[PDB]
Design a protein around this ligand. Sequence first.
Ligand SMILES: *[C@@H]1O[C@H](CO)[C@@H](O[C@@H]2O[C@H](CO)[C@@H](O)[C@H](O)[C@H]2NC(C)=O)[C@H](O)[C@H]1NC(C)=O
Ligand SMILES: *[C@@H]1O[C@H](CO)[C@@H](O[C@@H]2O[C@H](CO)[C@@H](O)[C@H](O)[C@H]2NC(C)=O)[C@H](O)[C@H]1NC(C)=O
Ligand SMILES: NC1=N[C@H](O)[C@H]2[C@H]3O[C@]4(O)O[C@@H]([C@@H](O)[C@@]2(N1)[C@@H]4O)[C@]3(O)CO
Ligand SMILES: *[C@@H]1O[C@H](CO)[C@@H](O)[C@H](O)[C@H]1NC(C)=O
Ligand SMILES: *[C@@H]1O[C@H](CO)[C@@H](O)[C@H](O)[C@H]1NC(C)=O
Ligand SMILES: *[C@@H]1O[C@H](CO)[C@@H](O)[C@H](O)[C@H]1NC(C)=O
Ligand code: NA
Lengths: 1307, 56
Amino acid sequence: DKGRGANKDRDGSAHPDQALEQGSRLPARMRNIFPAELASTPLEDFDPFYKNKKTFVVVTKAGDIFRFSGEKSLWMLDPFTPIRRVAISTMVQPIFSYFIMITILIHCIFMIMPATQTTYILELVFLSIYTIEVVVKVLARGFILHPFAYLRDPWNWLDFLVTLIGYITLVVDLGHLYALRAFRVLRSWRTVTIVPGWRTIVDALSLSITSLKDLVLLLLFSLFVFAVLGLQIYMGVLTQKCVKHFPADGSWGNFTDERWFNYTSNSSHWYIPDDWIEYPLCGNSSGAGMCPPGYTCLQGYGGNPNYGYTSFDTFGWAFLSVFRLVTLDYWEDLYQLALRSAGPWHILFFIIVVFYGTFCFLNFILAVVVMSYTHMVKRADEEKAAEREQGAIGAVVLSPFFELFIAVIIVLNITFMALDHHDMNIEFERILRTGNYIFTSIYIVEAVLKIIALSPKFYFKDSWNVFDFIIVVFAILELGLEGVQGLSVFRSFRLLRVFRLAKFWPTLNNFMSVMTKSYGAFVNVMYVMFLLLFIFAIIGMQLFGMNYIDNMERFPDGDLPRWNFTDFLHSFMIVFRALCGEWIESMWDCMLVGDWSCIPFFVAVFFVGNLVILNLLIALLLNNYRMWSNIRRVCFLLAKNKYFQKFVTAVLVITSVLLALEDIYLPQRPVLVNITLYVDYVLTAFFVIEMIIMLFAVGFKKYFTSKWYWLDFIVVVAYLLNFVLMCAGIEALQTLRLLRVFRLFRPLSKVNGMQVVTSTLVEAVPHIFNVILVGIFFWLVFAIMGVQLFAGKFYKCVDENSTVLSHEITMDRNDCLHENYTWENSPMNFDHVGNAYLSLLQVATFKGWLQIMNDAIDSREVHKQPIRETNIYMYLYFIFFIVFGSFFILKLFVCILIDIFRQQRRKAEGLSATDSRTQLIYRRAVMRTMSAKPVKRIPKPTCHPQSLMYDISVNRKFEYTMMILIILNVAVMAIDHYGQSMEFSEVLDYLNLIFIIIFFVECVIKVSGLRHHYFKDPWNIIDFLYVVLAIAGLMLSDVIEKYFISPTLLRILRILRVGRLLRYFQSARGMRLLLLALRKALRTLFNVSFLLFVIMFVYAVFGMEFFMHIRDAGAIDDVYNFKTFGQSIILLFQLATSAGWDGVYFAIANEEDCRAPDHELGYPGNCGSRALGIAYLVSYLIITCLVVINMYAAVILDYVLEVYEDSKEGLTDDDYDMFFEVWQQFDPEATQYIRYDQLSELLEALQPPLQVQKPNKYKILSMNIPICKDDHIFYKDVLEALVKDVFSRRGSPVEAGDVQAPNVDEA
Amino acid sequence: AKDGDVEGPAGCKKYDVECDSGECCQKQYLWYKWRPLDCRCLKSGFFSSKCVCRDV
Ligand SMILES: *[C@@H]1O[C@H](CO)[C@@H](O[C@@H]2O[C@H](CO)[C@@H](O)[C@H](O)[C@H]2NC(C)=O)[C@H](O)[C@H]1NC(C)=O
Ligand SMILES: *[C@@H]1O[C@H](CO)[C@@H](O[C@@H]2O[C@H](CO)[C@@H](O)[C@H](O)[C@H]2NC(C)=O)[C@H](O)[C@H]1NC(C)=O
Ligand SMILES: NC1=N[C@H](O)[C@H]2[C@H]3O[C@]4(O)O[C@@H]([C@@H](O)[C@@]2(N1)[C@@H]4O)[C@]3(O)CO
Ligand SMILES: *[C@@H]1O[C@H](CO)[C@@H](O)[C@H](O)[C@H]1NC(C)=O
Ligand SMILES: *[C@@H]1O[C@H](CO)[C@@H](O)[C@H](O)[C@H]1NC(C)=O
Ligand SMILES: *[C@@H]1O[C@H](CO)[C@@H](O)[C@H](O)[C@H]1NC(C)=O
Ligand code: NA
């Protein structure tokens, strides 16, 4: 074999084995020089005394192949050396290996504690015990040989490099290179191999990194294009501030261009409110930020936002801003900063980077990680199969109508734990504590009556009865320690009764029957995740921990942030936050007190943490989870007529655009008020007429049973109800008018690709609904526990404006109200289970979680002033919820849409659900050869001047140097920076002119030669449109400059021509695999993105009617609000990825100090409606973010897995396109016939896997090709003869037999 | 007015004192105005509550 035969053929003459260990074994062999009775095939323990250990393991070392022992290469000093014989009998024995795993695990404890002088001398004894490991193991294996060296396995490289660093950091360099001292923690990666089952997850981790090489180069190319695109349209724009006018009547002189600049550069003359560390941005566009009326909105004054780290002023900062946007990390702050200064039409830049960045390329990262883990599981499951190859109590207690009684008591008891809250009555508190004594007395009597009818030989076997017996013994110790004011945490084990119900409703029991089955897979991934988080938390604490203390003055107020690197627990939490997807806020504070080396740290903890480890958790969830009869003829013909249905669709679309135009400022448009009024009368007659036409066509029983017609019937009733109100008195309800938007989901379901997108949503809703119910259950356990920890503890004494007092001034609520301050509660507060649910939603979506977790770790006791970080171990509550509620329940929605979309695409393509995967690879290869046509060549002309021009046009050396000059034209754009000198820009505009004249030459060669066929290639249009506008921008001396040609529009066409390089990436294999999956999925990815816009239209119009008049709180202000349609689409697109929904919630639920709507004065009221705001955002976040954004990951997983499967077994569409690029040069006129003599030259000119090697004529006659008249053969007969050749040699000639039956049944 | 005005019968319970709804004053002069009292049960641990005269 490759490894199983080469390692044995090298044992023949080169170097043999030395020893083996399979269940306490240690042999003594040699390299066929002087071996003394080790083993030939004796399987016995007669000769030696030490070979008896390696004698009974003859049936254990041959388990799978050789996966039981390891073999040294005895080739340097093995025999006649008594020292090296001890070294084999030291390395092999397991007590030497379990001694190091204790030594590493003790050494990791001394890292999480702050060091001292006794830590140093204890550090020195670990450094001399790891030298003993190296000096023994090098002595038994040799330093570097070709067989089996010490520096050959990459677990000894980490053993050796970390030991050599512990010499350098302990004899010299005590001030310089502090950084290398922190990489002695990488030795703790070796303790992965102590948790059983690790080789499945580590080998999937290694395979994921090496299979992302083709995608990291494609992602770095796409970040390059988006950063140059962001550089050319956004440099200088984040420095736009409202600046005060130069004072006309007064000081600062009269006027001078030096005194104007002196006045304007002053920071005191720039507009800030009496808050807001950063300054607000303005713009001169029609929907940008507006200045107060003494200001003028200038560009170029005083620093970029976020300490200067958020800009497009240079290529490197544009590269960080674009990477922040694809990675989706606080992007709504970059999004709102960009549209406030450039205007709202720049939402188009953000749509393009989100669509191709996070909805495509971060979903190719998930697909590679899923394929890597699935391939490692099928390797392990295949190998595991090779391992395989008292009398009356019984009528009462065992009654099925008695088990129903306990199921009532449990649901009653779960309700009484959720009804417990802060500041209740006495009589309400008396019911809950009396219900405790009843429910425990029921549970005791049940456990006695089930051990008298099921005597305790049998009771303790059921494994629910022994769980229930633990509940009863906790209830009596709670009852005995009831009056005691001692420990009293036994009363916290009342939460464990909630899992006793799982016994009854089965989809909770079937949910937990998976976790108790595949628990070893979850343990290996959780331990590897927490081991990575440990390694990063010690490195960053020693790299960056001292900068926070030494440079504390650079932070605002001169105080440490909540998130820092000063000790281990802060360092673990700031690294855990980056795995949840938030890293740039912790990296701004790191670069402020530190150097540049915070940027490689926070990308690597994001790349390993979020993109690889959490995607491995999703991969592990997939694998485990007579006039009456003539009228019904006319109405039936109208209902089926095609021109009638286009009219009905057109009315519904035109009328819904009218519904987006009614907003604020509508009573100032009095003509538009009358337009929308008469439309409501035409529609309330249109809906009635179209209902009675469909009621005579379809009938009664087929009308009122359809789901689209019940939706249709409600809109008819809603416009008859609004009709009879306006005919008698009452003005029409505006909510019932908006029900006509639902009429346009049925024309949306017929747009040529929405059959797969809507069927994977209708079929997913009973699966989504059971995951909601299991989600509501597990969050209920954490919601009760958060009430029992934090109810009443989020109060604090506050100043007159917003400031929390110190605890030295105000100690309690007595001190706060004696000094006339305000004792105030937090808006997210854990005061009852309903508030806890809304709090646990913000910690699971990671939007708002930072303020909830500040209040939890500052909490002391009821009526005490909170002190910062006074119980910092309350972080353990939030880690345990994020792992089991966010990382496990919310990613289970992605698993649902992946499985259903595999089914609904197999249904739509006509395929069967009874053919295996190997039978469908064979069918796809037959469907493609029958839909294949030869490509006709572009004709060569005859006049001498224009024929040469054709010959140099089609040349590949011309097409290569045409691509180099496009890459050179755009790399010059990447060195534009903000503030460049005028002599720098004159160099780059003379170099730009010599590129326009070259691109004008190669455009006219490709039109003189290679005629009107030129305009069929989609990239020759953009190559033509740029060169025309570039000559027009330089010619015409009288450049108008009044809106003539945008310099932005000219610079987008330069960058858009780089997409020709996606055609030249079709030479690299892994890139060609990955662009093909994007090309085949691009129709159904657009259909998801067009369903998404129709859902956004529904929430825009309803949100414009609920939240048009609310006052500016939270994240809602004079730019971002629900006042118009265009401004609603700005918010709901941000809200579609859940980014910043906590501050939108704070304004659309704000009902504290709000004016009431007065109908007589004509005042709308600015108030919030908390109840309607919860049902707006939570309904939006679960529809648009959990099931429709996760639809992008369902589609890309199904097309990437299809294309990679054709690379391994099938034929991959580009290899059909490969066939007709070489059929073309032997059949140029599309005759679709070549002669018999040419096919020996054609079969060699092919590419793998479709090429036939020379000598061809030995292999040509082996296959039968039906030759037509005059030695002419057909392309279909050649191609079908080659597909049979490909499927003959891959697996077996038996699997060549399964492809004729598609070739016969279809032809 | 003075901090500690009972405003009720004798044997009544003041602010922040345990009670059983039979011993609770009608009002109380605490923090610069007259505030009523009602015996409410506040959160004081896991499924534990201490019932105390609290202002409403
Ligand atoms: C916004 O428009 C104003 C004009 O209303 C521009 O202000 C001019 O800026 C230049 C320097 O950039 C001054 O010398 C002029 O005196 C300003 N004009 C007026 C009328 O004040 C301003 O540049 C624009 N801001 C942008 C494009 O960011
Ligand atoms: C709190 O506000 C009250 C509201 O009037 C202020 O009232 C004073 O109360 C003190 C002590 O009870 C009296 O001696 C004064 O006559 C009150 N008036 C003024 C103007 O002082 C009180 O000032 C505020 N608290 C403090 C500590 O000043
Ligand atoms: N990457 C982030 N996404 C959230 O949308 C943001 C909001 O929530 C949060 O807690 O604090 C603020 C910001 O730091 C956040 N960071 C934090 O998570 C926030 O703007 C306040 O609402
Ligand atoms: C800013 O303005 C103030 C008064 O307008 C002036 O005294 C001061 O010197 C100016 N410059 C700086 C750098 O503060
Ligand atoms: C010009 O303004 C800057 C601050 O804006 C100030 O430091 C400088 O002194 C000013 N020039 C004069 C002549 O005052
Ligand atoms: C706001 O804070 C400042 C600074 O602590 C304080 O002096 C002021 O009283 C506060 N309240 C206001 C301005 O209403
Ligand atoms: Na962040």
